[PDB]
Amino acid sequence: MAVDIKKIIKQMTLEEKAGLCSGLDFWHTKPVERLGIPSIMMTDGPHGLRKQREDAEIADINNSVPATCFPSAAGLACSWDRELVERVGAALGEECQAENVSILLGPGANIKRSPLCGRNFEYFSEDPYLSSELAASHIKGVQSQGVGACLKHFAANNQEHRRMTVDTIVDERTLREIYFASFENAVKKARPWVVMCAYNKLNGEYCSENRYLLTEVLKNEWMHDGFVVSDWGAVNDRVSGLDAGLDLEMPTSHGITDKKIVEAVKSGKLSENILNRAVERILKVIFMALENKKENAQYDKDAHHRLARQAAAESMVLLKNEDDVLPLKKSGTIALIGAFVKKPRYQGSGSSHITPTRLDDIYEEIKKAGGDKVNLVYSEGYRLENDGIDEELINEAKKAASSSDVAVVFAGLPDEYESEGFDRTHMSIPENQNRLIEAVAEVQSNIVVVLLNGSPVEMPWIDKVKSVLEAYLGGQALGGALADVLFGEVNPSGKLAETFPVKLSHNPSYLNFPGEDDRVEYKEGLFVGYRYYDTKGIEPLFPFGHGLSYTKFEYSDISVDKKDVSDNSIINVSVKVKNVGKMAGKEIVQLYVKDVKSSVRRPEKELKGFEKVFLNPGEEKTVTFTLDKRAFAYYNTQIKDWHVESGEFLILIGRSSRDIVLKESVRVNSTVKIRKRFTVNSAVEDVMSDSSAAAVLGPVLKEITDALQIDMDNAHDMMAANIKNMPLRSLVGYSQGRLSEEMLEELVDK
Amino acid sequence: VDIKKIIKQMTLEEKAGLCSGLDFWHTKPVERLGIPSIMMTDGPHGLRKQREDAEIADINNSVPATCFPSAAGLACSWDRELVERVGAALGEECQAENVSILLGPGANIKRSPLCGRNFEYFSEDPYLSSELAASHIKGVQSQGVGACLKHFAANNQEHRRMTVDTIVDERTLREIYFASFENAVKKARPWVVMCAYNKLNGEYCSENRYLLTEVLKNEWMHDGFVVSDWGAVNDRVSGLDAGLDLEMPTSHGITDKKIVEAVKSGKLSENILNRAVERILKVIFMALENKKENAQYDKDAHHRLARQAAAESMVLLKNEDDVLPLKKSGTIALIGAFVKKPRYQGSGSSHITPTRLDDIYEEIKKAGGDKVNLVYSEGYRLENDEELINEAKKAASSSDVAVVFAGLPDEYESEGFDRTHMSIPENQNRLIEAVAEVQSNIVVVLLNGSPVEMPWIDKVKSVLEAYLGGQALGGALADVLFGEVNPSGKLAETFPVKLSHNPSYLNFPGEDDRVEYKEGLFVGYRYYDTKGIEPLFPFGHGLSYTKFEYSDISVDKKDVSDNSIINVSVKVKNVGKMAGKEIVQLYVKDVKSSVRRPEKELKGFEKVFLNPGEEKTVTFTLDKRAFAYYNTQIKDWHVESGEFLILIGRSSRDIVLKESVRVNSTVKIRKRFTVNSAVEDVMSDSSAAAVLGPVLKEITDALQIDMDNAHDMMAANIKNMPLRSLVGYSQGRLSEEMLEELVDK
Ligand SMILES: [Cl-]
Ligand SMILES: [Cl-]
């Protein structure tokens, strides 16, 4: 096919090639009817299709063709289930084929640096391994149906405030280990047809014209074979952008930037090979979509609704379950309290907003699962229409809670709190909802709180409640999934993909979010998410990877393939997980790697593997993990490559980042050695660390150290520490030759 | 006028020789012109003059002098008068030993609890540090000798202190690290300032012209000279041009030969050299005029002062069930190796050979009297054992109260290296836990120069923090333990629960000759307050044997300008039965500001003595600097118009009274807009908004977008949108260039 692609570009005029690198309208590429090049359509989004209708204004974001609204990424990621996410991706692909969409503008895979980021609900995790794995699964599913996925937003689009002008200042190592890392394996393992650049600047340059970002990292290093699309209106200098690696500008600019491409080529400022390479990347995707186009495609809207119900039920997180209040008994009286019972929160706002084909009713689904023997009572409790206080609602809700055997309060973040375009300003539930939970907990000790929200929230009442069910934004089948888990038809198996801090101010980005004067600096560096709380010793409300189950899982017999391993070697880790309870369920096994000693500062531990296993009561199965070099390597900026510092590494396997149950030690070694360059201002102790250089300076230093009667093995003496901190030039001040020192420095480097 | 006439008579070799030392402690004399040689020596909390018949490397073999409490403990007095008196006692001892310049005080900010020299620094707060440093300098120089402020600047770690590149943003320097030295220079005018060993943003402090000339000599108007740290000079000519006047110690003419060669070559102007010589000579002859021949000081009175300084700066961190003060009856058990070998000073160039030394056991027995049965048990050994623990448990159970003396051994804290952890030795922790099991009434006295973790804090009733109390520590401990002195010390630095909590933890001591202060302003309590992290004991915390009730907070004005001044008043009443001193603390909070600044910052403190039932009024004056942050754009202190809270309390976390104030400025910063400026930012300038409003109004209505909906995506897209994107939302590029011209004009 590629031989035919080159033949088509030879037949295209310069104006036709430059027009292809820009959109036709808001969602379509320009056709070339002369050569049979068709026009393809791309649209949102990550957790559901949002195709705008024909007779709709461009700003009418929600006026779209009905499609399945799946759980958003923030909740779906809590499944830790690569298979479940791929199936949701395949369902999205099926719906694209049915609606003649060639490219889905998803998934979103930006790192959750701050809990306040407005789009956290449609992102996966604060961890680059969990994010990349689930993003790769999402892409594989979408593209298994013959349509393209668009990974976004590349990169470091971690706040909505000033996202179109802010200069994001991130050091290289933090990028390689955290923000680039979230996208890296999604590109490498899933090979998405398109990657979308971000609105923001990264270290002085907009991502749409950042050649290091788009060409050096994405296209050359990671070998991205598809094309790169801009975010909508993210193009600044089109010619600079095309040379940097931005292939397709969206939306259309009505030929303004197209004429700039043609004039720059004819002027000689822009090589035509740059244009041909971008056209070739775009045409490859266009014809790959045409090749996989399914005529008269249909999907089963009811089957996708049941999938959305399963996806939500298997990603809900049981944060707390004191006295095993959940699952609810199918008897007695159950009280449902909250405005979210009738008007539930199930998705976010912005370009990802979905017009659902259906929407489950929470009260009816629970009543259906409860049965005849259950008496179901509802009380409004609080009102979303007014952020005020209404003691009549609180008093009526307390009376309903007292008469019942159990009270279930549905609370969380209203629709206005979370959206694309702006961030949250605080991390707390509306006060009228907090007053209700505390009031219900006073009169009914058996109180369950169901949280509907796209991002972490503070829970000041956490000690007054028995059960907290975190459903995130569960999609259009939230009601059924809630009924399934609350009554135990589904054993909850979701575990958090991001840290829930006690206070917003605890979070690592707090002092540097959202920045000042079109500038934000990631001064926390690597220490994002649980990496911060673990290393700082700060206890979150609920840690990364936390999630309970109606059953208990016992870990035992941790195995390792090897104990002494090299950089180019591979270790195999094994653990046996047994369901020691009475109810079947799925357990998310988590593997972390700890570097006990390293010259560079690294987090306490980093997630490097996760699997989900289903276990019947009493059943035991073995779970396996493979450990790459990348499981032990940090990014070394000097050699511009991943490096493993020789030392001991702990393989931590547990039920959460703070529930490690088994550990094993391994020793990983490297043949790579970093060469340090010394000067006349280099510390004496640093030069004596290189045995080659120590042979040159050791004897000379011995003459001065004994003449000064200084002990150098006394690690608690000032003069010993002065000799260690001394620059080499100060040694000549005792007894040497200035020129002789320069020769010794040359020999040390040689 | 006579100084300039002397410089005309000096040869070029003599001018270059004066800018470098004669030996380790003396300047070069010029006998031809009557220029004498003056001596400088350590240190901040006591005189350490090396003896004549002493080896050159024998750091501790010095003339006996009074060892006062080090700065870390002395700062907990919060008493400018007490610190100045200690400075004056230091000056008298310099005069007695013919020392013209004391190499003190040290005033570097406590960024990390692990810094090795924290024991001889004042505080983590630049206001408390600058005020007490100014008091120390005033005291020393009231006696006719010079003080040497050190170390300038940002010398906040001992690891690689001679090669590390310290990376600090401008605003953090101006508000925290420079600020610790600023008012000490301005209010006390020390004769000498010492540069630090480290690099500050790429340049050694010894040749950092922005540091020594632009900030210290030009902006702050330092009229004395600048001396290098010992061996901190790199390129002598560069340093002389940068503002480094005196290189110490001597280099035996090596750098002197570089200065003469650089002047004769024409690379270095002689006016630069003459200006440095004039700064050195001005101080030399100012010392000669104030030289007191054959001066003697009262060694006993300075010992009592060192006892008073320690007793008034010990911090009662905890006192559950009022175990302290101890009763003068029953049986009291003193446990710990620190009973016989107490920790009372640090290690390094500031180490003092004391003229006297109180014995903890004898002073306590003396203060206890006939009715007290005093029993001793060793408990633990510093040299390395359950026998010591078992004997100590029987002694604690047999007693009515047990007092354990614990802390950091001498090897832990010194100049030259930092601490690696923040806990007292484990054999001491095991002992405290064992004694707390069998004796519930347990008092822990801590001897240490820097914060320590206290995992046993819930097992003990009283914790008395004595820091490094000096040569009269034993008497001062007896004074406070039995209530002869009502303790009034309050922490000058935050005591974290865990080392990892502290702001510098992820960036200390750095890597590869580089450390970056990525926490910025948020050092000390500024970090814990804004982050909501609970310290073990907060900044400004300290208990008393009596209680003080605050009331009637008054304020001079409620609406004030940038150039105005506010006067704050508060009434403090001793509502207890015992007289005592209370440290009143004033903080300023900026409730809303465009720049990120801490939750609150200390801007005033006073200490008042109150007899039982007595009430006195405490007054504060609030400068422009009390509300201003450092604005890097205008390179000046700036006050954003808004509301400010005046917080008065007994500690940084015990605010008792508050008052609201509104501070305004007529100074307005002009922002320059481009085609890449956000629409919302351009609408912030009412002049420029008048240019863009109409054009933006057409686009907003054509798209049916509500712009008063602060929770809508499309409204937020218009706000974040660059002006160039407006053409994409329908406009003309050429009209946009004209609109940008009108906005800037
Ligand atoms: Cl990212
Ligand atoms: Cl400093």
Side-chain angles (χ1 to χ4, degrees), chain B residues 673-683 685 687-690 692-696 698-726 728-733 736 739 744:
Chain B
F673 305 115
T674 65
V675 293
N676 296 341
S677 288
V679 170
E680 192 185 33
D681 291 333
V682 183
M683 302 296 295
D685 182 12
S687 62
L692 181 62
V695 179
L696 178 68
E698 289 214 41
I699 295 324
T700 279
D701 292 74
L703 300 180
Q704 307 218 316
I705 296 181
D706 182 11
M707 294 297 312
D708 280 324
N709 189 345
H711 294 274
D712 174 60
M713 167 188 88
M714 295 295 319
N717 282 341
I718 304 294
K719 298 183 198 174
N720 287 339
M721 159 184 312
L723 304 182
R724 55 166 211 267
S725 290
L726 274 181
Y729 282 58
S730 320
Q731 231 292 271
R733 176 170 298 114
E736 166 63 38
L739 214 53
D744 284 355

Side-chain angles (χ1 to χ4, degrees), chain A residues 162 505 510 536 601 685, chain B residues 160 500 505 508 596 680:
Chain A
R162 290 299 179 280
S505 57
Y510 183 70
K536 295 283 300 179
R601 190 72 68 100
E685 194 185 33
Chain B
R160 291 299 178 280
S500 57
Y505 184 70
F508 188 96
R596 293 297 288 270
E680 192 185 33

Side-chain angles (χ1 to χ4, degrees), chain A residues 109-111 153 155-158 178-180 182-183:
Chain A
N110 291 94
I111 285 292
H153 316 82
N157 180 28
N158 309 112
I178 301 295
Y179 298 95
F180 289 171
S182 178
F183 293 87

Side-chain angles (χ1 to χ4, degrees), chain A residues 467-551 553-556 558-567 570-575 577 579-581 583-596 598-662 664-666 668-670 672-673 678-688 690-701 703-707:
Chain A
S467 302
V468 178
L469 184 53
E470 174 62 276
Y472 266 104
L473 309 180
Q476 70 181 55
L478 168 76
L482 280 172
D484 293 332
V485 171
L486 282 173
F487 284 110
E489 268 288 320
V490 172
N491 192 0
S493 59
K495 296 185 181 178
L496 286 177
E498 63 173 333
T499 300
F500 269 47
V502 175
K503 314 169 174 185
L504 163 69
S505 57
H506 284 171
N507 96 86
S509 74
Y510 183 70
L511 305 177
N512 289 286
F513 188 96
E516 304 173 32
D517 297 312
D518 275 354
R519 183 180 177 97
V520 60
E521 306 179 32
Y522 295 6
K523 285 197 263 176
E524 74 280 359
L526 295 191
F527 303 93
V528 174
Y530 70 96
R531 293 170 163 76
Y532 174 82
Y533 301 88
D534 293 349
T535 312
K536 295 283 300 179
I538 290 168
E539 271 280 22
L541 179 66
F542 296 111
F544 174 86
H546 171 78
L548 300 182
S549 176
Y550 297 162
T551 189
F553 301 102
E554 164 190 9
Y555 292 50
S556 59
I558 173 162
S559 175
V560 283
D561 187 7
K562 311 146 88 177
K563 292 273 270 189
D564 291 301
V565 143
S566 64
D567 276 15
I570 286 177
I571 315 176
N572 296 271
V573 192
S574 290
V575 268
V577 187
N579 178 5
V580 303
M583 184 175 168
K586 299 187 189 182
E587 164 74 341
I588 297 170
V589 183
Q590 300 170 30
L591 186 150
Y592 300 84
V593 171
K594 170 175 182 166
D595 191 353
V596 302
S598 57
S599 294
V600 300
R601 190 72 68 100
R602 312 180 65 183
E604 166 77 6
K605 61 177 145 66
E606 306 186 37
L607 182 78
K608 291 300 183 181
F610 63 93
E611 298 285 352
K612 196 173 200 181
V613 296
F614 171 83
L615 290 174
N616 285 284
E619 192 177 8
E620 185 180 341
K621 294 188 298 198
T622 292
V623 192
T624 63
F625 303 93
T626 181
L627 292 188
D628 204 24
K629 175 201 163 173
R630 293 284 301 267
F632 314 97
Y634 69 97
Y635 188 84
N636 194 292
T637 56
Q638 180 188 355
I639 67 181
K640 292 184 181 174
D641 193 16
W642 297 90
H643 187 242
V644 179
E645 216 166 76
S646 295
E648 178 193 5
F649 291 85
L650 266 48
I651 309 178
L652 311 181
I653 299 186
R655 304 170 261 177
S656 80
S657 63
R658 308 210 164 196
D659 191 3
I660 299 307
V661 287
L662 306 171
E664 184 70 48
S665 305
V666 299
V668 183
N669 310 116
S670 176
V672 185
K673 299 291 174 298
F678 303 117
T679 65
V680 292
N681 296 341
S682 288
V684 170
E685 194 185 33
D686 291 333
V687 184
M688 220 65 58
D690 182 11
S691 185
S692 181
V696 181
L697 182 62
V700 179
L701 178 68
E703 174 178 346
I704 289 83
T705 191
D706 292 357

Side-chain angles (χ1 to χ4, degrees), chain B residues 108-109 153-156 177 181:
Chain B
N108 290 94
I109 285 293
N155 180 208
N156 309 112
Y177 299 96
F181 293 88

